[PDB]
Structures are given as C-alpha cells and as structure tokens.
Amino acid sequence: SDKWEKEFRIRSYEPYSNIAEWADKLMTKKYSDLDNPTGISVKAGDDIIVLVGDTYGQNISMQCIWETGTEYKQTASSGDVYMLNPGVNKLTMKGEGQLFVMYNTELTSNTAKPIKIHIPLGSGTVNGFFDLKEHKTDEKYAELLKKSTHKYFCIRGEKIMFYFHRNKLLEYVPNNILSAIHLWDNIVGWQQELMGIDDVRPSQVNNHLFAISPEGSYMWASDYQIGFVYTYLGNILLEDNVMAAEDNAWGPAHEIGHVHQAAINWASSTESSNNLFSNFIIYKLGKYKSRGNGLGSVATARYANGQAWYNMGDATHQNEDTETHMRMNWQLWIYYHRCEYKTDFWQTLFKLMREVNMTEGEDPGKKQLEFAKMASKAANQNLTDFFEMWGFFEPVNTTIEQYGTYKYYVSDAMIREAKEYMAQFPAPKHAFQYIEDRKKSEFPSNDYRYSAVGDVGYYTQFKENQKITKAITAELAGRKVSIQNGDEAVAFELRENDENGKLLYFSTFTTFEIPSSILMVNAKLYAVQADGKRILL
Ligand code: NA
Ligand code: NA
Ligand code: NI
Ligand code: NI
Ligand SMILES: [Zn+2]
C-alpha cells in the first residue's frame, strides 16, 4: 500500500504561468493557479514536513485550500499560504483542506524546471488525485477514487480540472472519468481555439480552468474558478446526461464563455457575446442545431420598434434580449467559418480586439464601434450593411444596467468616423446579414425555431453563391406581402427610394405582414441575391 502513498508523497511539480499577467494580456477572467494539487489532505494543527529539492532560484509555496461562504459552503479559491525553501520545511496547518504547490513563474526561462518535493510518511493523509496524462485509465481512476477519503477529490485534465464532492463522484461516475474529462477538456480547448491564443499556449500560458461544486447556486463563472452546484453534477459527469438534451451542454459552455468574452464584449452584450462560444460548442458536439431567435426578431426590434443594438428587444434597458443578440457574432462565424470565406476570421478578430484593449464597461458606445471596425479589418471587407442592420449606427445617449451601471453614448460623429474607416475596405462579396444555419424542415412545429427561421437565406445559398434565375414576383394585399418564385433569394427588403435608400423593413419569409408603424410612402420592394444584387419587385 506504500506504492500508492509514494505516487503522491514524492512528486516532481511542474511550473505553471502567472494568472494575473495572462488575464491582462488575453483579456479573460483569471484562470486557476490551483494547477498543482499534492493529493494530500490535512487537519487543523497537523505538523507537516516538506522536503524541497533544488528550486533553481524560484520562489514556491504551499497553500491549504478548504471552504468559504456564509449562506452555504463551497471550495474557496485561496487559503492559508506557507513559504517553502530548498531543504527542510516544517509546517503547522492553521486549518484543514487539501495541499496545493504554488509554483508560478515565467515558463520560457531555462530555470523553469520541475521541482521535486517530498512530503514524508506520517505528514497529513494521502487522499490522492487523478491526472489524465500520467494515470491514463478509468481503472486507475476508480482505484484512486475509492482509496480517497476526503470531502473532495481532484481530477486534473489537460485544460480543465474538477474539484468535486467525493460522494457525488461515487453516486454518478464511480468507475468512469475519461469520457467526462475528455469532453470538458474539448470544450475549453474549443473556446480557446476561436480566440486565436494557440501561439502562446502551452508554451507561455498553461493554467487550467478549475471547476468546483458549490452546495448552493446553480452555475457560474468567475476569476479563479467556475461552479456547478453539487446537486446538478449528474448532468456534468455523464456525457450521456450532457448529450441527452439540447440545453445540457449549453449552460456550462456559456459559463466558460464568460471567462473568455472580454475582448469582444461590451455592456449590453454580456449575456450574449459569450454565446458565440456556446453555439460553437453545440456545433462541435454535432447533435443539435443552433440556438437563438430568427432574423424576424431583428426586423421587429429595429424597424417595427425603432431600437438600436443596446436596447434590442429591451425597452427597459435593464436585462438583455440574449436570444436575438446572440445571432450577430454567430452570423459572422456561419459565413466566414462554416461557408469558409475566411476560416480564421474569429481568431483574427479576437487578436485585433485584444490590441484595441478596451474593458467591457469603460466606454460601451465607442466599443461597439471599435468592434464593427475591427470586424471589417478582420474580414478585409466593409461590413457597414451588416452592422447597420444590427443597429450599430443609431445614436444613443443614456445609461444602462448590466453587472454595474454604464454610460452608453454613440454620437453622429462617432457613427460618421466608423463608417469612413470601414469604407476603406472593399465591398463584401455577400449580403450575409441574412444568413441562417437552420431551415424550417429540421424542426418540429412545436419548436420555437420552426416558425422563427424563415424560408430563405440558408447558408448553402451563400456558400454556393446561388443566383436568382426565376420569374420572381410579389403581390401586396393590405399589409400582407407574398413572394412568388423567390426561393433563390436570401431576403426581401423595403427600402426608402431606390436600392441604396435606407432600409425600412426586411423579411426572410416569402409571406409576411408589414407592421403598421412602417412608413410605406415612396417605399419599394427588392429581393436580395446572395451576393448583394438587389432586384426590384
Ligand atoms: Na505517478
Ligand atoms: Na497532466
Ligand atoms: Ni518517503
Ligand atoms: Ni440607421
Ligand atoms: Zn451568463
């Protein structure tokens, strides 16, 4: 049984990067610095011997992690810290918890080597912990789990760690962790993929995300740790519980989205900008279709109701219409990525937005415009029409509430400069503001998407540059428009005078009611071809 004790009591601990630093450079919430569990539990007053080999001039320490919270209990993100020096260290635990070695430094340095640390028999208790790359098997996992005896058992993957209640692991996955750990690692790695931060990971930044099980709340993300309530873990740990319903994979991936949204996020978007990641994950898991409202929601909000981006579907200015907003980033991915007109668009755009380096709340009005401009630069196309449709070029002077209160100010002159800046790029090859990745026939009639996604503008029409080749007509009966032979178009527009007058309404349905509030006088109807050609009707 000592071969088990020595797996954990004698170990070479690798260096991990500094979290504060990389949070700044990559514009994320802070990852965890609890990358190096010992696998050793302790109790208050315990005398602990730690023998540290050569440290190469590094400063390392030991931290006891336990629990925090008044309302209920959860795993804390920091704890009692004890300094370590090369040689002999005798520590007296101020409290219970598990031990973690804090070895955080610059990774490119030739002195960033593993440090051997020996916690000799009789010092605390060996709980154990499972690492994916070194223990490799469900079988070893079960063994370690059973031998474990502490309230929490740590599981370390490549990109994420779990730090969950022992008995919940026993109750749900008492014998199999590989599926779970491979899946959550994939999510994190996918979100990280879109951000274009592969150049610096794992060579300069290598910290994990660290998932705890609070005895309260539902699910969330913050600096240092992300949380999934312990009564819910069954939908975390069993990939069949994750893959069984649409919304099981989402809510978590949305939570890891919060960690990564800052570069491209501004207040008014905080609960939608992260669902670029959410929808990317769903796409990658390969079973369900995309989430969000149809473009009819945009038209209604923008035009029947005069709203701009910041208050779309939201006259109050307090809580966000996430189901409408989330389609905006996603359309950019559908076109540039799924239709392959630029397969590293998002990676490029994230890089640019990190260079812009604006916080989410410092100036949301200007940030919205910086994002339209950087998206134009990222595509190397002038995306003025996309961003007009989405309500980026409407004046705003007010204040909003979303995790704080913020001044939202967009002026005519700000609007003017963004457009001129974006003008310097060539015209877009397609009017992909009308793109969808969903068609009606994929959904049952009780699904909200069946009625919401419209009839035209499916992504293949943009990917195969479909032309309009048919006897396309239109009949107006009261407020009801009906299009004949328009199934090759991508949308239908009411413009102000000619095909270059401002947009007054649009639809991706071939039959639709115009709302009363639209002003019809001198207004014309055009069918939009995938590539931007408008055609009078
Ligand atoms: Na080992
Ligand atoms: Na590992
Ligand atoms: Ni020993
Ligand atoms: Ni406008
Ligand atoms: Zn959220």
Side-chain angles (χ1 to χ4, degrees), residues 7 11 134-135:
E7 257 281 18
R11 163 173 316 273
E134 104 157 303
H135 298 142

Side-chain angles (χ1 to χ4, degrees), residues 302 388 393-394 502:
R302 286 283 285 110
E388 169 71 39
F393 309 132
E394 311 297 299
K502 92 184 193 287

Side-chain angles (χ1 to χ4, degrees), residues 5-6 9-10 51 118-121:
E5 299 226 29
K6 289 199 194 313
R9 283 189 176 285
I10 289 162
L51 309 188
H118 186 189
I119 298 174
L121 285 157

Side-chain angles (χ1 to χ4, degrees), residues 383-404:
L383 295 181
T384 296
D385 295 345
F386 183 83
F387 287 104
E388 169 71 39
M389 192 194 70
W390 277 107
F392 277 58
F393 309 132
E394 311 297 299
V396 195
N397 203 319
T398 171
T399 72
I400 56 163
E401 194 263 311
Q402 198 180 43
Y403 310 104

Side-chain angles (χ1 to χ4, degrees), residues 288-314:
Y288 305 99
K289 303 286 162 192
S290 79
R291 178 161 154 172
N293 283 343
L295 303 173
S297 285
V298 183
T300 297
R302 286 283 285 110
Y303 301 112
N305 290 333
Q307 299 167 338
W309 167 263
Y310 91 99
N311 67 338
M312 195 169 280
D314 181 39

